[PDB]
Amino acid sequence: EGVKTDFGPPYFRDLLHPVIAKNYGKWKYHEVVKPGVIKRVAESGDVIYVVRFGTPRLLSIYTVRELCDIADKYSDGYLRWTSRNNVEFFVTDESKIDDLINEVQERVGFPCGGTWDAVKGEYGLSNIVHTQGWIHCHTPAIDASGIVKAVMDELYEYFTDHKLPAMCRISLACCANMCGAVHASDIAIVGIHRTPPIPNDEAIRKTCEIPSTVAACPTGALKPDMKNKTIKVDVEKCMYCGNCYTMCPGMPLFDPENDGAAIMVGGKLSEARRMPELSKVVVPWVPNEPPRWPTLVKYVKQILEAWAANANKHERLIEWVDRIGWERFFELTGLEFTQHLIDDYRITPYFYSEFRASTQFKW
Amino acid sequence: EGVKTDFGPPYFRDLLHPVIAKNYGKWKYHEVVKPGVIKRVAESGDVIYVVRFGTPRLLSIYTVRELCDIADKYSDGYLRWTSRNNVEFFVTDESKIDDLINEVQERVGFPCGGTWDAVKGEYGLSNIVHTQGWIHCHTPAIDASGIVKAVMDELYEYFTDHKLPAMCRISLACCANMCGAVHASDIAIVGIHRTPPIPNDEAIRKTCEIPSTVAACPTGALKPDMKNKTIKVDVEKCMYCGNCYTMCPGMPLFDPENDGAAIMVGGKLSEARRMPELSKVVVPWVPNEPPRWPTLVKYVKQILEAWAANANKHERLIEWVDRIGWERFFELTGLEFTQHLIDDYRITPYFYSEFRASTQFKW
Amino acid sequence: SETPLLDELEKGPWPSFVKEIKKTAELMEKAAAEGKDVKMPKGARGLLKQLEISYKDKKTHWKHGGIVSVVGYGGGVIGRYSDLGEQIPEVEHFHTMRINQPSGWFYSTKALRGLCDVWEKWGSGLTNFHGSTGDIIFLGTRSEYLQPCFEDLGNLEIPFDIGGSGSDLRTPSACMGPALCEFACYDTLELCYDLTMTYQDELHRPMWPYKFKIKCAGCPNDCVASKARSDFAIIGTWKDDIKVDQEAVKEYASWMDIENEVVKLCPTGAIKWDGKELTIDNRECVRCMHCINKMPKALKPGDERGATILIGGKAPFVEGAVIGWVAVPFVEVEKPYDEIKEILEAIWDWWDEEGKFRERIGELIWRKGMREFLKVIGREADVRMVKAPRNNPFMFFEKDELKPSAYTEELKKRGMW
Amino acid sequence: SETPLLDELEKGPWPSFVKEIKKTAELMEKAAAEGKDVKMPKGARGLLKQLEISYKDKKTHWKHGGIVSVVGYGGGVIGRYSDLGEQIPEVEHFHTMRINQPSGWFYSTKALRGLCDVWEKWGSGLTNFHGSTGDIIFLGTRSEYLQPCFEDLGNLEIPFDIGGSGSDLRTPSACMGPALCEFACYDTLELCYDLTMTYQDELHRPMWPYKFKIKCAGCPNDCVASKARSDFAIIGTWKDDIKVDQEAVKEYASWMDIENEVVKLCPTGAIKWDGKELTIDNRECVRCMHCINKMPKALKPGDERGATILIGGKAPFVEGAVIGWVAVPFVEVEKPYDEIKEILEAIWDWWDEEGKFRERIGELIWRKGMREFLKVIGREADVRMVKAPRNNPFMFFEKDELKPSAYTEELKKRGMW
Ligand code: SRM
Ligand code: SRM
Ligand code: SRM
Ligand code: SRM
Ligand code: SF4
Ligand code: SF4
Ligand code: SF4
Ligand code: SF4
Ligand code: SF4
Ligand code: SF4
Ligand code: SF4
Ligand code: SF4
């Protein structure tokens, strides 16, 4: 016998809603009824209603069972999540759509919304993709779950409606190794340090493999100390990425007062209208202010409300910038351009800017 | 007393034709009358005609003496050269313009032309900026004067008339340190090596400062060899740039059978309509074939004719590509894309792609 | 008030995570007091008390992880310890388990309940739905519980395996694709699972110089952020014409501003509308999706389907953040996917043989060059791989491309060349 | 024939450089035969012969040169020696003297006649009009003749000094500017001349880590290729409105297609035409010049004039070819140009202090960062310096910007900060 291994996840096809299983790869068109409700008509003529809700991502198993109770009812015991950590139900009988929407709100407190209609041209804010934060991670500069709650509270109304002229993605990373699509979002919140690491010589000797710690620094600020058998850090060359702390517990760069978040904009993943773009820093640093992070929230709101105001139907934030330029962008958003925003990261090769970072090309 | 030094060039203002000195900074407008001939009208009412002629750049003083005789006869003893090495005369009596053109043509064999007219949107091909080649330089891969002569013979009709729909600059660099603005030219001819150097240890030891020879290598292919007090080359990392031979006579890499020219396109210097751009390689290599370099000339002409045949008015090569894309560019020019054309020059920083290399910005 | 700073975040309209954590501990302690087989009832409370301290301190309270796994596997379990280990005993070990999600995150209620049963028993009762990569996150358990927990997950009527972590093939993910989406150019969910199954060993037993991720997107809309979030982004596309029902477009133009909201927005001017006919120049089309996005009833992807493969996508670490670039312009997606597998394996053989410690595939290509990368996958250089040809003449030439000469014979004579 | 390969280049319509060399040979030989004081009657014919052997071998026959100069100067004369010196002794020494051009290449015939007489006497009789930087090139003389040639030059009725070469300020150059051009935003010729005179020492006596180039363009058309070919590109611009003559625009509207040739080609859509009234949104205009270029009788640069300065322009070596980027969005250009001279001297000091052997200014800025560069020239960062802000979060913060913290004190009493 022995403990069975190497069997993988369940086969997805066994976990499909019957109407979905039958009409697989055979749909005619979709239709957004109202915000949070999307209709899908099959080539067979069958009609199923997908219904989307915001989740905190982090779920109690009890808030899981309680979703399964709802699932058996409105949706034949079938269910799914999204790529942005929303939850979607599948209702056949369209009279029981609102019942679902209401029961969900009273049972678990999960708002209906998170959708968008490109056809008409009206968009809603979807969930924020984020990570662990102080809940579980050993190298964060900020905490995801908290800021997410604080931001979405302010910008709730946007998730619930289609009040936006184009698609806006808000995403978050708790440190520089930027987990999630954070480097490619319309608005990004990125945990940064602003303080170099003070080496712990004792902790390094016993635990740290030095040569790979030294090799993992992108600016070369680290040099092996032969003596001594420790690491030396050139403060002039450190930009507080904290990669050395990832590699070595003897290299903390943590300072509660100076750690914070940068805000980046102008990212894009889809091909539609224009090419994918990496996010760009437009606010160097805002403080950690648990629990409401009011400075962060105000600056995200400020930015989003600026682009919302000006942007033409479909025109995303980076597309807006394409049109007005960064000169007018910094004015309207009311942000200041400092030297911190001039790229100085030496190691990335120029030739990457010449590669096709897109599926867009002619045959 | 002692030898006079530090006195500089003659003050230009004492060398300006009286009508030009009088109306300095007081021009109404210019009109391109016909190829080679530009009318300039001053606010004062003075009218001067600037008549332009192609030159081989390498001039005989006896040619300079001839041009002086002509200048005394038609332009009151005044003359200039242009920034692409054409020569210009200043005629006030409009009824003498053709006497001049014909007399220049006859006496020195220099053709009138090398102009363009933005207003009507009709453009001449001007002179090819080029350097020393085998005439005087020790680091060339190709000749300069031979290739320019061979290209200008084939493209001559475009020098004397306004036959092209936009500006086309053709520029030649006899090696990779591209003396000239060859690196931002609509069509650039750039000499290259394809063979690594063979260290001559005796010559290196005698004449070369090792550390600066080593550090002149962009790919880090050179290492000092303490034992034999010389340099070792890692052939795997050498891309035959020639820089180490610029530094050190003990590092030649010339191979007369494998030296040749790359052909690059899509450079733009002016701001007009779109930003400046560095030229991009589209033919990796063509051989030196003196005296006519037929293979090189055939490709330059092939590229020019394809752009001319499809380009809209004003639309320079890079603007033509902005429109059609590189896929259609290689098809229309009949050129092959190979892996050579995928940029691999590692040292150049990505952040330079993010700097505003241009005077276009909003106030 | 035990937790004054966290309680501020139970307020507001957005679903509170603080509410989620409280809801867990309270019911887990309610279960354990009722004689239930709960090994960690104290888990979620201690987590809340530590997070409360972290909010006060404005710093993490988790230290570096002493490595841990299950029998047979090397990855899938991430070790974590609290530096308040003695003050809050129950979070001295709070290890995460990554549970392989079903392709496209589809679930029946049973499957989910099964997961809850095992985790209530062996863990903190705290989960993430879903993790960034796509895995189900079992958040917080001890070292000697890992082994029994894995036994039982596999013995469930709907059984789940462990996902990928460390220097392995990570758990692949895929957009909803053909399960829900009329845009799908191929069966994303089948491809995701098939891959997950084919390279089980490379997922569970990390052997590579670093991590490697794969994400499958139905169409160029990239609904799983594949180009940014994976080393190997398999994105759906087509070769022939966008299928256009002309009457359906008239149904749009009855109300829609097709000239402004569609025509003028097409990147390459390929799409025309005059009032009667819509015309698409598929030679000029870059299959950006917008027009199909705009008029999904009317417009559709072509019949000749497959995928473009974008290589390199990664977060910034070491050499810089990467949105994947074009590696394979077109490849067929048909079971058992031999053409895609052949590619993946060739890349892995090469990356294992040549990759430095903690070097991502994209950094390796950057270091080695596309020429080497292309010969490894056995494909030709193609203009579609670049936004533009190189802006400098510093090209490497292969030995065999050179004209034989006095000079090459000299190089030969000395054993260089 | 003596030169069958070069003879081929006496054919064809383009004026022949071979004819130029041969003419020199014939007439220098004739002049010397006539008793005229000509020290190098054979130099031209030696060059020709070496060039013919070069065409046959497809390689240079020049070697690395010895250092050579005129008394008092360390630059401006570049030694060149042939490897064919025994076979052709008249070209064994064949150095170039770079003679500083008048601003904008303006001459009277008396000036040129002076140059021709001096070079006839002491040199090959071969010249370039002009060197790529701008200088007159005296192509080919022996070492013993450099000094007496320079002396003769300096004693001419219209005298000519040596330009630059080596690690110095090279000979600045200027487009024609206000002498002929209605587009000029400043006096290019005057500025050029003034910098040349002001920094004679920096030009004649190389003292820097490498070469430094200045070029002066009167307007954004950049007719001296300054941004590609000079480390410090002074490019004319304006701050206020384009001057529009409406009646003149109507005179254009009668024959010229303004919508297609002007309106649709403006990079920012700032210029509108409705059939009666031309409008310019100068808040949207980026001063690209196309509209003015299209309509010089109607449109003029604005009244508040000066220059944008572009920094770093260079050929590839070391770190890549550079088109220069915005260092100074706007500076006034008024005699005696104190603001420009200030910027220059600050840059030079800093570069002399920090530069490596053979490091260009552009490369130093890439190495030290724009922050250090901007403080050196005492100016604030401007959004006009970048095409976009940084695509990564790895930002350096200065000490004074950080909050006073237990950590900042811990750093202080450790010898770091
Ligand atoms: C729900 C979800 C499917 C899934 O879970 O697998 C999804 C679903 C669809 N996406 Fe998406 N997208 C989903 C992830 C995305 C995200 C990826 C991400 O953020 O992680 C974006 C890429 C972000 C980016 O580009 O930076 C994405 C790029 C798009 C684009 C956006 C249009 C644009 O202008 O860029 C299309 C176009 C559209 O609006 O119809 C699109 C269109 C669609 C369509 C309309 C396709 C269809 O006809 O069914 C699907 C309906 C959703 C809707 O609200 O209209 N979907 N798609 C996605 C999860 C996010 C969520 O819960 O809100
Ligand atoms: C005489 C000369 C300046 C000098 O001091 O010597 C010059 C003079 C003029 N240039 Fe220029 N440019 C001169 C080299 C250049 C070069 C620099 C170079 O090629 O090395 C270019 C920059 C090249 C580039 O853009 O890549 C240059 C880019 C322009 C532009 C841009 C054209 C465009 O469409 O991008 C204008 C616009 C125009 O066409 O009227 C221009 C326009 C002009 C105007 C029309 C301005 C005026 O109001 O008189 C002048 C007459 C040119 C004509 O033939 O129409 N000039 N101009 C130049 C000698 C060139 C020759 O013999 O052919
Ligand atoms: C589990 C997860 C957090 C979450 O719940 O969202 C995670 C969390 C950690 N990541 Fe990650 N990464 C998670 C998805 C990502 C993604 C997004 C994705 O995979 O779709 C990225 C960007 C894409 C990429 O891989 O480049 C990402 C980029 C990183 C980086 C490495 C990036 C690089 O430049 O090479 C760090 C650094 C490292 O690996 O040492 C890292 C490493 C880590 C470590 C082990 C922290 C560390 O520095 O040692 C994390 C463990 C904390 C913990 O115990 O939970 N993680 N990480 C994410 C996966 C959930 C899942 O399994 O489904
Ligand atoms: C004379 C001239 C060629 C011509 O016929 O026009 C010239 C000729 C030489 N150049 Fe140059 N360059 C000439 C203008 C340029 C220009 C353009 C300009 O000045 O407008 C450039 C590009 C801008 C720049 O400087 O980057 C240029 C970029 C170079 C490069 C190095 C640039 C770099 O850092 O990459 C080399 C290599 C070096 O500096 O050692 C170089 C070096 C040389 C050497 C000394 C050859 C060598 O490898 O050491 C030249 C010897 C010629 C000879 O012996 O007869 N030359 N060179 C040009 C100057 C004459 C004049 O005074 O007007
Ligand atoms: S982004 Fe950083 S802090 Fe957040 S989960 Fe990833 S590694 Fe941890
Ligand atoms: S924080 Fe980053 S830059 Fe500083 S020493 Fe550590 S790895 Fe290097
Ligand atoms: S481009 Fe090269 S070969 Fe030509 S003169 Fe300049 S350095 Fe010499
Ligand atoms: S030729 Fe260029 S790449 Fe090769 S060793 Fe010399 S400097 Fe380096
Ligand atoms: S990527 Fe394409 S097929 Fe997949 S869900 Fe998004 S729009 Fe549909
Ligand atoms: S898919 Fe995009 S590029 Fe193609 S026709 Fe439609 S809008 Fe244009
Ligand atoms: S740079 Fe401007 S001012 Fe100078 S000649 Fe050219 S168009 Fe006239
Ligand atoms: S100068 Fe250029 S940007 Fe300004 S209005 Fe004219 S064409 Fe437009």
PDB file of N, CA and C and ligand atoms in Angstrom, chain B residues 30 38 40 52 80 82-84 86 114-116 118 123 126 167 169 268-270 272-273 316, chain D residues 175-176 181-183 221-223 225 293, ligand 2:
ATOM      1  N   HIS B  30      11.575  81.803 -46.524  1.00  0.00           N
ATOM      2  CA  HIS B  30      12.384  81.176 -47.551  1.00  0.00           C
ATOM      3  C   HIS B  30      11.404  80.502 -48.532  1.00  0.00           C
ATOM      4  N   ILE B  38      17.396  78.158 -53.274  1.00  0.00           N
ATOM      5  CA  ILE B  38      16.481  78.664 -52.254  1.00  0.00           C
ATOM      6  C   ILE B  38      16.485  80.195 -52.166  1.00  0.00           C
ATOM      7  N   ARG B  40      15.572  83.565 -50.246  1.00  0.00           N
ATOM      8  CA  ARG B  40      15.367  84.095 -48.919  1.00  0.00           C
ATOM      9  C   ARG B  40      15.044  85.589 -49.002  1.00  0.00           C
ATOM     10  N   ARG B  52      22.811  75.616 -54.120  1.00  0.00           N
ATOM     11  CA  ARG B  52      23.498  74.497 -53.452  1.00  0.00           C
ATOM     12  C   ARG B  52      24.092  73.462 -54.415  1.00  0.00           C
ATOM     13  N   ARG B  80      29.523  79.407 -48.491  1.00  0.00           N
ATOM     14  CA  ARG B  80      29.516  78.626 -47.251  1.00  0.00           C
ATOM     15  C   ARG B  80      29.537  77.151 -47.588  1.00  0.00           C
ATOM     16  N   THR B  82      27.553  73.519 -46.100  1.00  0.00           N
ATOM     17  CA  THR B  82      26.497  73.062 -45.196  1.00  0.00           C
ATOM     18  C   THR B  82      26.984  71.971 -44.219  1.00  0.00           C
ATOM     19  N   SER B  83      26.099  71.594 -43.301  1.00  0.00           N
ATOM     20  CA  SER B  83      26.341  70.565 -42.293  1.00  0.00           C
ATOM     21  C   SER B  83      26.283  69.123 -42.822  1.00  0.00           C
ATOM     22  N   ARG B  84      25.940  68.955 -44.103  1.00  0.00           N
ATOM     23  CA  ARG B  84      26.149  67.678 -44.789  1.00  0.00           C
ATOM     24  C   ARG B  84      27.181  67.831 -45.915  1.00  0.00           C
ATOM     25  N   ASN B  86      27.688  70.084 -48.445  1.00  0.00           N
ATOM     26  CA  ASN B  86      27.410  70.631 -49.762  1.00  0.00           C
ATOM     27  C   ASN B  86      27.965  72.040 -49.720  1.00  0.00           C
ATOM     28  N   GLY B 114      20.598  68.743 -53.993  1.00  0.00           N
ATOM     29  CA  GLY B 114      20.676  68.471 -52.553  1.00  0.00           C
ATOM     30  C   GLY B 114      19.740  69.277 -51.669  1.00  0.00           C
ATOM     31  N   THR B 115      18.640  69.762 -52.248  1.00  0.00           N
ATOM     32  CA  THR B 115      17.615  70.467 -51.463  1.00  0.00           C
ATOM     33  C   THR B 115      16.358  69.628 -51.281  1.00  0.00           C
ATOM     34  N   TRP B 116      15.426  70.167 -50.495  1.00  0.00           N
ATOM     35  CA  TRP B 116      14.072  69.617 -50.370  1.00  0.00           C
ATOM     36  C   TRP B 116      13.058  70.728 -50.062  1.00  0.00           C
ATOM     37  N   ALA B 118       9.561  71.101 -47.926  1.00  0.00           N
ATOM     38  CA  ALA B 118       8.515  70.658 -47.024  1.00  0.00           C
ATOM     39  C   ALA B 118       7.145  71.188 -47.438  1.00  0.00           C
ATOM     40  N   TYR B 123      11.072  66.057 -51.973  1.00  0.00           N
ATOM     41  CA  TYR B 123      12.366  65.990 -51.301  1.00  0.00           C
ATOM     42  C   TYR B 123      13.473  65.452 -52.183  1.00  0.00           C
ATOM     43  N   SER B 126      20.002  64.275 -50.107  1.00  0.00           N
ATOM     44  CA  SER B 126      21.204  65.091 -49.992  1.00  0.00           C
ATOM     45  C   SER B 126      22.511  64.277 -49.991  1.00  0.00           C
ATOM     46  N   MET B 167      11.951  63.199 -46.295  1.00  0.00           N
ATOM     47  CA  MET B 167      13.401  63.304 -46.104  1.00  0.00           C
ATOM     48  C   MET B 167      14.045  61.933 -45.971  1.00  0.00           C
ATOM     49  N   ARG B 169      17.907  60.557 -45.234  1.00  0.00           N
ATOM     50  CA  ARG B 169      19.312  60.745 -44.970  1.00  0.00           C
ATOM     51  C   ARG B 169      20.025  59.415 -45.093  1.00  0.00           C
ATOM     52  N   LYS B 268      16.087  58.956 -37.124  1.00  0.00           N
ATOM     53  CA  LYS B 268      15.513  60.276 -37.366  1.00  0.00           C
ATOM     54  C   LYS B 268      16.121  61.209 -36.345  1.00  0.00           C
ATOM     55  N   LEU B 269      16.627  62.362 -36.791  1.00  0.00           N
ATOM     56  CA  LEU B 269      17.159  63.394 -35.875  1.00  0.00           C
ATOM     57  C   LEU B 269      16.159  64.508 -35.536  1.00  0.00           C
ATOM     58  N   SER B 270      15.464  65.037 -36.546  1.00  0.00           N
ATOM     59  CA  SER B 270      14.515  66.139 -36.309  1.00  0.00           C
ATOM     60  C   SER B 270      13.352  65.693 -35.434  1.00  0.00           C
ATOM     61  N   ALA B 272      10.310  66.774 -36.096  1.00  0.00           N
ATOM     62  CA  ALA B 272       9.097  66.993 -36.895  1.00  0.00           C
ATOM     63  C   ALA B 272       8.208  65.738 -37.023  1.00  0.00           C
ATOM     64  N   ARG B 273       6.952  65.847 -36.605  1.00  0.00           N
ATOM     65  CA  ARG B 273       5.927  64.773 -36.705  1.00  0.00           C
ATOM     66  C   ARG B 273       6.121  63.628 -35.724  1.00  0.00           C
ATOM     67  N   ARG B 316       8.828  59.810 -43.384  1.00  0.00           N
ATOM     68  CA  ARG B 316      10.174  59.251 -43.479  1.00  0.00           C
ATOM     69  C   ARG B 316      10.152  57.772 -43.124  1.00  0.00           C
TER      70      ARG B 316
ATOM     71  N   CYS D 175      24.517  75.415 -36.713  1.00  0.00           N
ATOM     72  CA  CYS D 175      23.785  75.483 -37.980  1.00  0.00           C
ATOM     73  C   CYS D 175      23.820  76.937 -38.420  1.00  0.00           C
ATOM     74  N   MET D 176      23.501  77.196 -39.681  1.00  0.00           N
ATOM     75  CA  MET D 176      23.448  78.580 -40.214  1.00  0.00           C
ATOM     76  C   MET D 176      22.714  79.594 -39.354  1.00  0.00           C
ATOM     77  N   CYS D 181      18.303  81.881 -41.697  1.00  0.00           N
ATOM     78  CA  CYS D 181      17.115  81.087 -41.362  1.00  0.00           C
ATOM     79  C   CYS D 181      16.070  81.857 -40.553  1.00  0.00           C
ATOM     80  N   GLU D 182      14.823  81.845 -41.023  1.00  0.00           N
ATOM     81  CA  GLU D 182      13.742  82.550 -40.326  1.00  0.00           C
ATOM     82  C   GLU D 182      13.208  81.757 -39.124  1.00  0.00           C
ATOM     83  N   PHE D 183      13.741  80.550 -38.935  1.00  0.00           N
ATOM     84  CA  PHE D 183      13.327  79.662 -37.824  1.00  0.00           C
ATOM     85  C   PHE D 183      14.180  79.805 -36.555  1.00  0.00           C
ATOM     86  N   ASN D 221      14.546  71.513 -35.401  1.00  0.00           N
ATOM     87  CA  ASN D 221      14.876  70.763 -36.619  1.00  0.00           C
ATOM     88  C   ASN D 221      16.270  70.140 -36.547  1.00  0.00           C
ATOM     89  N   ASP D 222      17.120  70.702 -35.691  1.00  0.00           N
ATOM     90  CA  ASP D 222      18.451  70.181 -35.392  1.00  0.00           C
ATOM     91  C   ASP D 222      19.300  69.863 -36.626  1.00  0.00           C
ATOM     92  N   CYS D 223      19.522  70.892 -37.433  1.00  0.00           N
ATOM     93  CA  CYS D 223      20.239  70.796 -38.706  1.00  0.00           C
ATOM     94  C   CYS D 223      21.777  70.609 -38.570  1.00  0.00           C
ATOM     95  N   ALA D 225      22.692  68.040 -36.322  1.00  0.00           N
ATOM     96  CA  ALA D 225      22.649  66.691 -35.750  1.00  0.00           C
ATOM     97  C   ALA D 225      23.229  66.687 -34.349  1.00  0.00           C
ATOM     98  N   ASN D 293       7.352  74.346 -40.502  1.00  0.00           N
ATOM     99  CA  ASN D 293       8.004  73.825 -41.730  1.00  0.00           C
ATOM    100  C   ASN D 293       7.071  73.795 -42.940  1.00  0.00           C
TER     101      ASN D 293
HETATM  102  C1  SRM E   2      21.502  74.301 -44.972  1.00  0.00           C
HETATM  103  C2  SRM E   2      21.193  73.401 -43.773  1.00  0.00           C
HETATM  104  C3  SRM E   2      21.812  73.966 -42.463  1.00  0.00           C
HETATM  105  C4  SRM E   2      23.302  74.317 -42.315  1.00  0.00           C
HETATM  106  O1  SRM E   2      23.635  75.126 -41.413  1.00  0.00           O
HETATM  107  O2  SRM E   2      24.180  73.799 -43.042  1.00  0.00           O
HETATM  108  C5  SRM E   2      19.722  73.126 -43.475  1.00  0.00           C
HETATM  109  C6  SRM E   2      18.842  74.087 -43.768  1.00  0.00           C
HETATM  110  C7  SRM E   2      17.492  73.963 -43.699  1.00  0.00           C
HETATM  111  N1  SRM E   2      16.889  73.021 -43.087  1.00  0.00           N
HETATM  112 FE1  SRM E   2      17.680  71.464 -42.231  1.00  0.00          FE
HETATM  113  N2  SRM E   2      19.393  71.984 -42.948  1.00  0.00           N
HETATM  114  C8  SRM E   2      20.516  71.222 -42.975  1.00  0.00           C
HETATM  115  C9  SRM E   2      20.674  69.976 -42.495  1.00  0.00           C
HETATM  116  C10 SRM E   2      19.656  69.355 -41.852  1.00  0.00           C
HETATM  117  C11 SRM E   2      19.915  67.971 -41.331  1.00  0.00           C
HETATM  118  C12 SRM E   2      21.115  67.644 -40.433  1.00  0.00           C
HETATM  119  C13 SRM E   2      21.739  66.424 -41.117  1.00  0.00           C
HETATM  120  O3  SRM E   2      21.083  65.852 -42.040  1.00  0.00           O
HETATM  121  O4  SRM E   2      22.885  66.024 -40.769  1.00  0.00           O
HETATM  122  C14 SRM E   2      18.539  67.524 -40.916  1.00  0.00           C
HETATM  123  C15 SRM E   2      18.397  66.698 -39.644  1.00  0.00           C
HETATM  124  C16 SRM E   2      18.271  65.271 -40.223  1.00  0.00           C
HETATM  125  C17 SRM E   2      17.134  64.465 -39.626  1.00  0.00           C
HETATM  126  O5  SRM E   2      16.045  65.015 -39.373  1.00  0.00           O
HETATM  127  O6  SRM E   2      17.313  63.255 -39.406  1.00  0.00           O
HETATM  128  C18 SRM E   2      17.767  68.779 -41.142  1.00  0.00           C
HETATM  129  C19 SRM E   2      16.440  68.743 -40.876  1.00  0.00           C
HETATM  130  C20 SRM E   2      15.533  69.665 -41.241  1.00  0.00           C
HETATM  131  C21 SRM E   2      14.056  69.474 -40.905  1.00  0.00           C
HETATM  132  C22 SRM E   2      13.321  68.110 -40.860  1.00  0.00           C
HETATM  133  C23 SRM E   2      12.699  67.421 -42.072  1.00  0.00           C
HETATM  134  C24 SRM E   2      11.736  66.333 -41.605  1.00  0.00           C
HETATM  135  O7  SRM E   2      10.708  66.156 -42.277  1.00  0.00           O
HETATM  136  O8  SRM E   2      11.963  65.630 -40.577  1.00  0.00           O
HETATM  137  C25 SRM E   2      13.473  70.701 -41.585  1.00  0.00           C
HETATM  138  C26 SRM E   2      12.078  70.720 -42.215  1.00  0.00           C
HETATM  139  C27 SRM E   2      11.877  70.942 -43.684  1.00  0.00           C
HETATM  140  O9  SRM E   2      11.937  69.941 -44.445  1.00  0.00           O
HETATM  141  O10 SRM E   2      11.612  72.102 -44.065  1.00  0.00           O
HETATM  142  C28 SRM E   2      14.690  71.401 -42.159  1.00  0.00           C
HETATM  143  C29 SRM E   2      14.505  72.587 -42.851  1.00  0.00           C
HETATM  144  C30 SRM E   2      15.597  73.380 -43.164  1.00  0.00           C
HETATM  145  C31 SRM E   2      15.329  74.760 -43.692  1.00  0.00           C
HETATM  146  C32 SRM E   2      14.157  74.693 -44.697  1.00  0.00           C
HETATM  147  C33 SRM E   2      14.999  75.913 -42.763  1.00  0.00           C
HETATM  148  C34 SRM E   2      14.805  77.275 -43.395  1.00  0.00           C
HETATM  149  O11 SRM E   2      13.836  77.906 -42.924  1.00  0.00           O
HETATM  150  O12 SRM E   2      15.598  77.740 -44.280  1.00  0.00           O
HETATM  151  C35 SRM E   2      16.665  75.066 -44.303  1.00  0.00           C
HETATM  152  C36 SRM E   2      16.614  74.801 -45.841  1.00  0.00           C
HETATM  153  C37 SRM E   2      16.720  73.318 -46.266  1.00  0.00           C
HETATM  154  C38 SRM E   2      16.060  72.860 -47.557  1.00  0.00           C
HETATM  155  O13 SRM E   2      16.770  72.407 -48.494  1.00  0.00           O
HETATM  156  O14 SRM E   2      14.808  72.898 -47.658  1.00  0.00           O
HETATM  157  N3  SRM E   2      15.881  70.818 -41.832  1.00  0.00           N
HETATM  158  N4  SRM E   2      18.425  69.755 -41.675  1.00  0.00           N
HETATM  159  C39 SRM E   2      21.565  71.982 -43.693  1.00  0.00           C
HETATM  160  C40 SRM E   2      22.504  71.364 -44.736  1.00  0.00           C
HETATM  161  C41 SRM E   2      22.102  70.001 -45.346  1.00  0.00           C
HETATM  162  C42 SRM E   2      22.425  69.617 -46.794  1.00  0.00           C
HETATM  163  O15 SRM E   2      23.400  70.067 -47.471  1.00  0.00           O
HETATM  164  O16 SRM E   2      21.671  68.767 -47.314  1.00  0.00           O
END
